[PDB]
Amino acid sequence: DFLTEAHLDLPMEFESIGKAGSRLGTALAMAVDHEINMVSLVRNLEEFFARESCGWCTPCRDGLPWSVKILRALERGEGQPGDIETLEQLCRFLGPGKTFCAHAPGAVEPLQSAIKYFREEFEAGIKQPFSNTHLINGIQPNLLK
Amino acid sequence: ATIHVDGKEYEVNGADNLLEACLSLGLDIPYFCWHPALGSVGACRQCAVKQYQNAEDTRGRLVMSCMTPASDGTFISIDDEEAKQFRESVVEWLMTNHPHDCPVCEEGGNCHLQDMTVMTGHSFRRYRFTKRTHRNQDLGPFISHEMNRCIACYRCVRYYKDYAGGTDLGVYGAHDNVYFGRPEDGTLESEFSGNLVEICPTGVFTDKTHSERYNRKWDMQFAPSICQQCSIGCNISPGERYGELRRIENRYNGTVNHYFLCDRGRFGYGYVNLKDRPRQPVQRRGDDFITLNAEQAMQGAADILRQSKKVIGIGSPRASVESNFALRELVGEENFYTGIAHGEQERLQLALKVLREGGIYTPALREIESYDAVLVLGEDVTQTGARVALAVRQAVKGKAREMAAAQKVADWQIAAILNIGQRAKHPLFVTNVDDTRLDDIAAWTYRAPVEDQARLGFAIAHALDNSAPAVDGIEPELQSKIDVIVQALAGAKKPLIISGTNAGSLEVIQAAANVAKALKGRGADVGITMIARSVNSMGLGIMGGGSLEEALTELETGRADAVVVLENDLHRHASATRVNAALAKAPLVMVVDHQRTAIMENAHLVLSAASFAESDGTVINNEGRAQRFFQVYDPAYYDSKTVMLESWRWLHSLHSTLLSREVDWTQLDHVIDAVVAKIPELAGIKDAAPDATFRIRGQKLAREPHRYSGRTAMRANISVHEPRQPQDIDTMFTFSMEGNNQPTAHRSQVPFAWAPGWNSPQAWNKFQDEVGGKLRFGDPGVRLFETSENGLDYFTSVPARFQPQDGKWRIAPYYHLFGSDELSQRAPVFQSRMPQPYIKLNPADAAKLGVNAGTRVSFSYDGNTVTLPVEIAEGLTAGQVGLPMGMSGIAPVLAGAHLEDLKEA
Amino acid sequence: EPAWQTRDHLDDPVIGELRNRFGPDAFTVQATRTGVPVVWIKREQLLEVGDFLKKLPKPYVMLFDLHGMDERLRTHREGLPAADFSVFYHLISIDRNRDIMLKVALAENDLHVPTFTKLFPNANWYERETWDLFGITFDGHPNLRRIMMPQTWKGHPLRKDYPARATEFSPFELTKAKQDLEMEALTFKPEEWGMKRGTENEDFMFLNLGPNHPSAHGAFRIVLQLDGEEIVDCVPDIGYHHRGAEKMGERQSWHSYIPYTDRIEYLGGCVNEMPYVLAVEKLAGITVPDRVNVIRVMLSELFRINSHLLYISTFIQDVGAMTPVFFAFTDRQKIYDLVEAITGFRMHPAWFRIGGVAHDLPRGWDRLLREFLDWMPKRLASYEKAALQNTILKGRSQGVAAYGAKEALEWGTTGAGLRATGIDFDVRKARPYSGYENFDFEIPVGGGVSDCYTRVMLKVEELRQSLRILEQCLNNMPEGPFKADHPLTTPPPKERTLQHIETLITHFLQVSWGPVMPANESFQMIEATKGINSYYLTSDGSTMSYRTRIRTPSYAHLQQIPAAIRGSLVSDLIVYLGSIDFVMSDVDR
Numbered sequence A: 001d002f003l004t005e006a007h008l009d010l011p012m013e014f015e016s017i018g019k020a021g022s023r024l025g026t027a028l029a030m031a032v033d034h035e036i037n038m039v040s041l042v043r044n045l046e047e048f049f050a051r052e053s054c055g056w057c058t059p060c061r062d063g064l065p066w067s068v069k070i071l072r073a074l075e076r077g078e079g080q081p082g083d084i085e086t087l088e089q090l091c092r093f094l095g096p097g098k099t100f101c102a103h104a105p106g107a108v109e110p111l112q113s114a115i116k117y118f119r120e121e122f123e124a125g126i127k128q129p130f131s132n133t134h135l136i137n138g139i140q141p142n143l144l145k
Numbered sequence B: 001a002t003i004h005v006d007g008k009e010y011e012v013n014g015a016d017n018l019l020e021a022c023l024s025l026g027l028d029i030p031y032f033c034w035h036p037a038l039g040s041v042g043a044c045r046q047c048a049v050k051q052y053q054n055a056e057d058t059r060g061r062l063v064m065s066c067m068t069p070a071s072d073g074t075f076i077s078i079d080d081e082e083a084k085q086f087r088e089s090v091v092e093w094l095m096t097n098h099p100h101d102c103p104v105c106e107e108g109g110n111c112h113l114q115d116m117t118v119m120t121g122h123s124f125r126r127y128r129f130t131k132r133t134h135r136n137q138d139l140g141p142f143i144s145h146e147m148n149r150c151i152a153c154y155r156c157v158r159y160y161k162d163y164a165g166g167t168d169l170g171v172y173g174a175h176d177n178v179y180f181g182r183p184e185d186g187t188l189e190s191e192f193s194g195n196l197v198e199i200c201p202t203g204v205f206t207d208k209t210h211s212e213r214y215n216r217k218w219d220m221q222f223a224p225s226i227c228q229q230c231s232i233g234c235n236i237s238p239g240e241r242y243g244e245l246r247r248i249e250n251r252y253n254g255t256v257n258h259y260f261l262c263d264r265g266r267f268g269y270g271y272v273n274l275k276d277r278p279r280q281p282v283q284r285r286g287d288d289f290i291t292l293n294a295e296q297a298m299q300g301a302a303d304i305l306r307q308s309k310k311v312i313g314i315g316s317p318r319a320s321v322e323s324n325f326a327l328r329e330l331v332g333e334e335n336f337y338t339g340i341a342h343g344e345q346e347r348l349q350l351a352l353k354v355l356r357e358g359g360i361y362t363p364a365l366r367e368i369e370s371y372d373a374v375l376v377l378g379e380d381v382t383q384t385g386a387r388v389a390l391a392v393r394q395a396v397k398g399k400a401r402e403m404a405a406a407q408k409v410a411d412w413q414i415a416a417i418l419n420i421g422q423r424a425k426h427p428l429f430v431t432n433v434d435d436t437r438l439d440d441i442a443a444w445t446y447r448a449p450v451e452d453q454a455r456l457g458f459a460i461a462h463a464l465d466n467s468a469p470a471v472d473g474i475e476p477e478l479q480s481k482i483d484v485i486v487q488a489l490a491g492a493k494k495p496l497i498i499s500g501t502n503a504g505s506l507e508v509i510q511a512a513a514n515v516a517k518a519l520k521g522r523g524a525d526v527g528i529t530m531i532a533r534s535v536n537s538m539g540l541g542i543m544g545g546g547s548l549e550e551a552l553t554e555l556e557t558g559r560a561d562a563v564v565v566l567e568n569d570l571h572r573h574a575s576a577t578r579v580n581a582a583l584a585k586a587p588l589v590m591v592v593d594h595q596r597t598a599i600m601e602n603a604h605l606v607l608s609a610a611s612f613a614e615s616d617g618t619v620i621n622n623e624g625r626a627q628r629f630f631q632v633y634d635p636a637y638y639d640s641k642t643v644m645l646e647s648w649r650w651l652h653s654l655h656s657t658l659l660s661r662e663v664d665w666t667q668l669d670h671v672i673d674a675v676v677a678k679i680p681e682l683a684g685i686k687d688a689a690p691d692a693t694f695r696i697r698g699q700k701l702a703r704e705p706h707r708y709s710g711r712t713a714m715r716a717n718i719s720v721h722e723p724r725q726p727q728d729i730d731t732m733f734t735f736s737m738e739g740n741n742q743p744t745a746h747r748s749q750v751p752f753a754w755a756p757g758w759n760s761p762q763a764w765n766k767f768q769d770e771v772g773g774k775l776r777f778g779d780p781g782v783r784l785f786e787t788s789e790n791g792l793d794y795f796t797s798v799p800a801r802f803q804p805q806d807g808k809w810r811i812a813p814y815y816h817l818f819g820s821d822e823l824s825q826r827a828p829v830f831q832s833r834m835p836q837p838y839i840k841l842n843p844a845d846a847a848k849l850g851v852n853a854g855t856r857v858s859f860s861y862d863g864n865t866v867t868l869p870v871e872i873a874e875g876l877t878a879g880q881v882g883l884p885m886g887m888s889g890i891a892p893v894l895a896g897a898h899l900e901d902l903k904e905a
Numbered sequence C: 001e002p003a004w005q006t007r008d009h010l011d012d013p014v015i016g017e018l019r020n021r022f023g024p025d026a027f028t029v030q031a032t033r034t035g036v037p038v039v040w041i042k043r044e045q046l047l048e049v050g051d052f053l054k055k056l057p058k059p060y061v062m063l064f065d066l067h068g069m070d071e072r073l074r075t076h077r078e079g080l081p082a083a084d085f086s087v088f089y090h091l092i093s094i095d096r097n098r099d100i101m102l103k104v105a106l107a108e109n110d111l112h113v114p115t116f117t118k119l120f121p122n123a124n125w126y127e128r129e130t131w132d133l134f135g136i137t138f139d140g141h142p143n144l145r146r147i148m149m150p151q152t153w154k155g156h157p158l159r160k161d162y163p164a165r166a167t168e169f170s171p172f173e174l175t176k177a178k179q180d181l182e183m184e185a186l187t188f189k190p191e192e193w194g195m196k197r198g199t200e201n202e203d204f205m206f207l208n209l210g211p212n213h214p215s216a217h218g219a220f221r222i223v224l225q226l227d228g229e230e231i232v233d234c235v236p237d238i239g240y241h242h243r244g245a246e247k248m249g250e251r252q253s254w255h256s257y258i259p260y261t262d263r264i265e266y267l268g269g270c271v272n273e274m275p276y277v278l279a280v281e282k283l284a285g286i287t288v289p290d291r292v293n294v295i296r297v298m299l300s301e302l303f304r305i306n307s308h309l310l311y312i313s314t315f316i317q318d319v320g321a322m323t324p325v326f327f328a329f330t331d332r333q334k335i336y337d338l339v340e341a342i343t344g345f346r347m348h349p350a351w352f353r354i355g356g357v358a359h360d361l362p363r364g365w366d367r368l369l370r371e372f373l374d375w376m377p378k379r380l381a382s383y384e385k386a387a388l389q390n391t392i393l394k395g396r397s398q399g400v401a402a403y404g405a406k407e408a409l410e411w412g413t414t415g416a417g418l419r420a421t422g423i424d425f426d427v428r429k430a431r432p433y434s435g436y437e438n439f440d441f442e443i444p445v446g447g448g449v450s451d452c453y454t455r456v457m458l459k460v461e462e463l464r465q466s467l468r469i470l471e472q473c474l475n476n477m478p479e480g481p482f483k484a485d486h487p488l489t490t491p492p493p494k495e496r497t498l499q500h501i502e503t504l505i506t507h508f509l510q511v512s513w514g515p516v517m518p519a520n521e522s523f524q525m526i527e528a529t530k531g532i533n534s535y536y537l538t539s540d541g542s543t544m545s546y547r548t549r550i551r552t553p554s555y556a557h558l559q560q561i562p563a564a565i566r567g568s569l570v571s572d573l574i575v576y577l578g579s580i581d582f583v584m585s586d587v588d589r
């Protein structure tokens, strides 16, 4: 999980970083500057995490590319209403115990951290309204409210 | 163990996982990757339930019900909001890349993925991006391949590799680009590839033979029946539409053929839908060919039968018990002849004597999978009795199962089972004239003539118990191999000995019986298994009669001026020239059959009988289990001109018209009672299935589903007036949906599996007391005989060593799964699958003859100089010629015979 | 908390009084989605429970329904007493605005129940129908004979083992012997009803009015005894219009049964559709949106105007004026143009669905509705001033076949007659279904007697109220979905079916095998065009209805007929037949 400047004065132990909503891991930290857009950065992380999946079990294999495509739409500004909620439910349903191994919880930790801390960057990628169906000539569509 | 689902207390089996623990009680959990026979791998992540360890627990944990053991004191919730939302999300993730292919899909209305999409209540699609696609491979004449519909549930690779033992289907690809198939295009060469059309939850692997003439599942008219293509007698569900047999589906029998058929029995049904088949009785005056209906044909046949001094009857091991008994009572006890030859009948009588007199318990097909050490003597199981070979593979993997269970690993953790047992497996020793399809797992394979295989069996029997007759003249290397087999069989706990009448020798069966007796004498739970040739070989041997040679010599000597041939081609058990001479000599031949046999030119009368899809009857499989097969459809519903009746009905009406000059179409129950009255040893066939008066709360059993369509229009081309639906007076079923097909009905004969919300072949889970175990309210079919109190003695007549005589060539039988059955080779779909007829030769003998592979060698057997191209068999022993049995012009009676004049031409 | 939830109903005061009277171990309470307290009561205490409910301080003075049920094949009978067959009695207390369903369990061999005819006189035809269709014998019943099937009929049709389809049985061959036997079986035999043919002085003469009479509105036959002109007694013979629609409910799926529910009353249409689809939505757990409720209310009121127009025209013609029926059918043609525009069919629309309607409203229906709402009131005033204020029609109608509130309650009379007797029990107000609380409309209540004229002008006022409801719906119409978003909505929306795969799967499995409603029990009672129509649906968890019971008001009116026309003239009987608003498809189902 990503951490902020306020978490910089935190000891580099397993339990201390694990208390503040992250992990110690390999303790080889990566610094992200203000010039780097977080949506594209998480997009690259998800491309790596979805193209390097082993392909055994359903949620990682068939939900990480969905997050990749959603972040592709957000990077180009073609986001549609309901994508951030989809990403949040995707993070919720790809936690520990849902998948066969621990590749997918580690995949969705940076996504949920970037949703939590940098939600205004993710909301800036939605410009077009939601349109999944197209108008079939001769059939009146159903309009849920 | 005791579990709690939503506050309800359930008593479960603690050695089981939670998924089928809940599925046994009738609790619906969506699942894809788990199968009752394969095991659990935890792949599809669809079976999530929320587990609590205390009775007062709020959070819980989403655990896999197929991967969590059902111990005592687990509080799981299925209909919780979190678990339901996660299962809906998994269904949605599987639905992201699924094609818009349901109308043009062969499993529409038979799809597991459809049932689990509607079960989780997912109907709204918010995925808006592109869908991945895949190319398709040509998997052969049987399996149509459509990889776009896959969900990567890994059932195909698991079954085909870890269960079927096949090597050509595998998993390739990447993260999301997972592919399931062959490294190239070509035919799936496994003999159990047909079960992929029901193992696969989606429409990837589909029945191409059904896809040719395709109808939906609710359009099918089903029936419970027994597969006729060999002696194992796997229970099937034939389903027809528009008057032709459409698709053979698997039928659950918890004791015989639980979840898997073989390809010969699944795709070999094409002979029923042939237009060359006789559908009306046809009478000849010289060259003039006329058509009669039933009454005038019966009266004329009775007149000609009365105008003869002795009427003889030639039965068949292909026909049912009732039809053969009807022929026997029509022609008399002493004038009834079995259609098999003398050697085949001798081997069949010996096999029956060992079964019902040898004192050794012959196991059923489900019970084979638990035996420890397997010795196959002579019988090529994989090409004759293939399901026994699959059960042999299961019994071989039982050792790795045992080491896994010793390490406190539950039985459903199949991945751990193959993890612990890397390559260690139970001993399997197969003997044949060449290499078998069981050589990948066999502890040893003995390639030798039948005399040497019999001598090997006698050596094993002598080296177990010294009272057995010894054979002298064994090489020390073969003696060491004998000692290895002896140490493997004597140290086991449940040894199994598998032989049969397909080896072509009697001493092989004698040696197998002696090995079983020697194993029994040492205090072991030993089982034996004889594989017969045809479906009702065992019943014909139990009833008995003369051989085909005696019938032919009665016809040739002139003492039989009238012969009734029941469902026999007569060229499969005797030479064509002698049969043609004995039939042209006889002044009346009456062939009662459902197939255009070659002897119908000599037939003075042809009676259109009914096949298994159009006739009711009883067949006795290779383990003495009587099984009733029912009628699927009335042939006269669509084609009203069709006079096509049951063979026992034909023969009983002919007997009644011969006696009292009246035509009396009987009922199946009357013939069954006649069999169990006149023949004490066939008395168990009354208990095979209940009579036509059996009702489930007053109503009959439905042959077609409740949503059968087009009742008022499927016959509107002929006449707009829909007639009365046919009435089944013989059995308890009806040709309509006004019947009972609930999963909780007190019956054993199930025509098809359907439950509300369960349309797939996985709907069989509701029809069982526990999922994967026996069928609820017992499995159909009863054993005819029990194990005897005392057994046979030691068979002393050992054979001599095979010395190749010059000039004469001993014929080694090479049985094929596609082509050695009489009726399956008539199917047009098997002609693109069966191999070309090759005569198989040793490299040394081929070099002596100077022939290379590809060239034609002509061989003469009874004035038939027939040419065959040559294949080289290294494993064949010198002095023999390898011939495929059941092919065109090569009968299975050729096994063990000599072959002079084998020259290159 | 939704209204379709399984409510066990221990909060009803009647359960408390029954516990305090018969003890805590005399009956069982069933939790169902019917909205009704279901009480399983032992057979010996059935008459005691009936008398106790009859003698409550605010008693159950109504026997709404009485019918049997075959429970031999019901697999999910958890929480239920052991039974091969059952008999349910649905009773209504109007002053309490409450209702109860008492079920008695019977074995397959001991199929006899104490009769319910003495407590409620309208139980006679229901017990005859239960004996005819289920084989259940009622001890103490006066004349236990078949009422749906002819007397030369073997077997009981509503049993589970009896086949449903005519193609299963032998085809209909009409030979001379069978024609003679069935014509002798249909012959009225006056000694079997104790008719006392003739008198010591002069003979009575028997007349078969139906079937095929210009005054008989359908397949109805009444056998009437005359001394001169006066009627001595009447034997109304029904069963000449039996279609076996309940057995069809056990034969068709949930979605495919909608045209069969639509043809139950062929002047009702969508009004017949509404209780069935509402009961199915109760079974599934579907709450329909506001636009669906408004659309179904609008179509129900349109078909109510059509039915009331036909009823008024037939009453005027039966009195003798043959002119206004043509203009009334012209207004029916206007309604038919509107219904053709919306549903695509004239008279049997088959348009309502599970969780919504079939299509959306086409572009321009408001213009046709405006044209009809302009066309109607002037025509109605013309019909009133031409025939309904005529003194000859008043003489033929006022005071003819009049009955009080006790006759309208003990005989199950509902609709116009019950409101004309002063009993203001309307389903659209007392138990409002399908969002009827959002529409303002008055209820016509008569002065205390049910004349033919009183019923006719109450139906005229009901037509005016339906016009008011249509005006309110037209002026204020929502803009939302025409189908619910529930996954069990059948069929799914069409465009999502055509370009989504989950919706395609749902539609594929819902039209092929049928939607899989869970194993539960539901009930929906509505106010039909001719009275009160109710659907009672038991689901065995399958894709079909395990039991479909349709209660219709014309059955109770036809059973009431001998008690309100005895001693009158044949002309009074003709006017009474014209002023009941019955159709024989409603009577026989």
Ligand SMILES: CCCCCCCCCCCCCCCCCC(=O)OC[C@H](COP(=O)(O)OCCN)OC(=O)CCCCCCCCCCCCCCCCC
Pocket (backbone or CB within 6 Å): C391, C392, C393, C395, C396
């Ligand atoms: C070439 C020759 C023909 C020329 C064509 C033009 C003339 C046509 C004449 C048609 C005559 C029709 C007469 C119909 C008489 C019906 C009488 C009748 O039955 O009245 C009974 C009815 C109810 O009586 P009530 O007292 O309620 O019942 C007692 C039961 N306790 O009583 C009531 O409802 C009360 C009112 C009775 C009205 C009786 C008829 C009045 C006169 C006839 C109608 C008007 C005809 C046109 C007149 C000229 C118009 C310009």
Ligand SMILES: CCCCCCCCCCC1=C(C)C(=O)C(OC)=C(OC)C1=O
Pocket (backbone or CB within 6 Å): C212, C213, C214, C215, C216, C217, C218, C219, C313, C314, C317, C322, C325
């Ligand atoms: C006089 C020519 C026809 C005028 C328009 C129809 C008049 C009303 C017909 C009513 C009616 C209906 C509905 C009806 O169903 C019926 O039973 C078959 C009748 O008896 C013959 C009727 O009279």
Ligand code: SF4
Pocket (backbone or CB within 6 Å): A053, A054, A055, A056, A057, A058, A060, A061, A099, A100, A101, A102, A103, A104
């Ligand atoms: S979560 Fe792990 S086991 Fe599952 S597909 Fe992804 S990498 Fe494979």
Ligand code: SF4
Pocket (backbone or CB within 6 Å): B098, B099, B100, B101, B102, B105, B106, B107, B108, B109, B111, B112, B113, B114, B149, B201, B202, B203, B204, C505
């Ligand atoms: S496999 Fe099932 S879900 Fe896929 S297209 Fe075929 S019927 Fe539809």
Ligand code: SF4
Pocket (backbone or CB within 6 Å): B149, B150, B151, B152, B153, B154, B155, B156, B157, B180, B199, B200, B201, B202, B204, B205
């Ligand atoms: S091809 Fe079929 S059996 Fe194989 S993984 Fe895909 S869905 Fe499963």
Ligand code: SF4
Pocket (backbone or CB within 6 Å): B227, B228, B229, B230, B231, B232, B233, B234, B261, B262, B263, B264, B265, B266, B384, B385, B386, B387, B388
């Ligand atoms: S093993 Fe024999 S009986 Fe079984 S399916 Fe194959 S051919 Fe039929």
Ligand code: FES
Pocket (backbone or CB within 6 Å): B030, B031, B032, B033, B034, B041, B042, B043, B044, B045, B046, B047, B064, B065, B066, B067
């Ligand atoms: S059934 Fe358990 S994960 Fe597939």
Ligand SMILES: [Ca+2]
Pocket (backbone or CB within 6 Å): B615, B616, B631, B728, B729, B730, B731
């Ligand atoms: Ca039959």
